[model samples]
Target: SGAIYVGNYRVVNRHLATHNDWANLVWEDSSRDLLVSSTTAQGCDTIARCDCQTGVYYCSSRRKHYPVSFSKPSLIFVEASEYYPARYQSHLMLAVGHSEPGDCGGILRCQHGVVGIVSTGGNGLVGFADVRDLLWLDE
Candidate 1:
């Protein structure tokens, strides 16, 4: 006779509420892509995207202008997204910096297809709106 089987799993959050939680992931590293991170505010509240090496970000806003900054962190992707959409989905980085026009701004660059997002706000901590997958080829 055949036997019956069942699968069960459990999740634990030991240090989830602590500030020293350091999460990471492991996968085959590729040179074609990199992580872009920052800890600064560019302008108004809006969503934006950025490139890790280029230090440029694209923002979705009314003016839709590109703002440059030196606060780029060469070491991004330090935090794992745990396969979460809002935390890791691809759609070009989005910044929630501004809601109105001219007050403060952000930028988005869709070259062929890929875009970069840059933004600014209170607390000095970086914020993101979304991520986008690029469809353009580099020359």
Candidate 2:
């Protein structure tokens, strides 16, 4: 699917109990949109204790700010989701970190559409909150 996400992107929103590192930079591979991910309290802590009270994530980030429509989660990711948790789990497990920074505070996305947030996972699995559940989070 195609997208148009714009405006301030979210930052560490919660402190999920998982992972180890946080200094993980968003894949600046240009192929990775080039960004250093510090979206969780536990996450920033890894990079030297930090927090988020802003709506922007562009140390070199930005492009769209509307409902984005992109490719679905990867196949292995979904399969791992089904094979691991109830809701599901997935992502590129090699170059990126597994919720390596945030939990419900982290953002779960595939290609474009914001799907979930950091929530659950382990043993070859990862977790996130349903993007649809954001309403109550805000309300």
Candidate 3:
């Protein structure tokens, strides 16, 4: 893959190095929310669930060394099943934002929600605002 440079930090082989090998994000039927994809042989360490109303998304990254670059910040939605109208469903889109290796940066916007989730440091960066209503400019 090509290189994605953020500030001075370079993201090389982001997908292959981190979750790309087996990481996935999906909606859980039982929970009716976003969940990390599960592999039969190798289970994922990170798991997150978002609240559209309160705009709070609880996330957990359980990798021994969480690859900050490749790891998707907070999950967002676009014209997907979890959207309104029910017509623009089926199109399950995911929005993952940028990450700073050691520096403090801004938030990342997902397709489903707004405001984007703010990054703290390493893992356990809980609490993401879902400003779906605020950003009415676009869906």
Deviation from native of the Cα of residue 4 in model 3, angstroms: 18
Model 3 agreement with the true structure over 1-139: per-residue lDDT tens digits? 1222222222222122235422442212211122223233432121123433222222333211121222323343322222232222111222233223322212233333333333222233322222222221221
Please give the RMSD of candidate 3 to the true structure.
15.6
**Please, what is the TM-score per model?**
0.23, 0.26, 0.19
TM-score of 1: 0.23
How does candidate 2 fare on TM-score? 0.26
**Worst ten-residue run, lDDT, model 1?**
1-10
Report the error of model 3 at residue 102, Å. Answer: 9.4
Q: lDDT tens digits, residues 4-110, model 2?
A: 12222232322321232135432221111112232343211111111211121111112323222222222233232321333223322211223322232344444
Predictions in order: lDDT = 0.26, 0.28, 0.26
Q: TM-score winner among the candidates?
A: 2
* Number of the predicted model whose lDDT against the real structure is largest: 2
Tens digit of per-residue lDDT, candidate 1, span 17-125: 1222123211111221222222123322222234432233333444444343333223233133332222222222323334321122233333322233232223333
Span of ten consecutive residues with least summed lDDT in model 3: 27-36
Give every collision pair in model 3. 55-130, 76-110, 76-111, 76-112, 77-111, 77-112, 78-111
